[PDB]
């Protein structure tokens, strides 16, 4: 919330990413290498977005 690995796309608070790579198969559908990939894709549907998966679908 301003001194974390703040994903600064932060559409909402939740939006921190990964150094490691740590796949999201976001609810936005989508699957994402890692946290950070999935940062701009909580960002893709306003922030709200949430997981399904650790890993992809």
Do not use: M, W
């Not at 989508?30 to 679908?57: D, E, M, W």
């Amino acid at each position: 919330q301003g001194g974390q690995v703040d994903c600064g796309e932060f559409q909402d608070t939740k939006v921190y990413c990964t150094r490691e790579s740590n796949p999201h198969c976001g609810s936005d559908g989508q699957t994402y290498g890692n946290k950070c990939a999935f940062c701009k894709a909580i960002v893709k549907s306003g922030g709200k977005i949430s997981l399904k998966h650790p890993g992809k679908c």
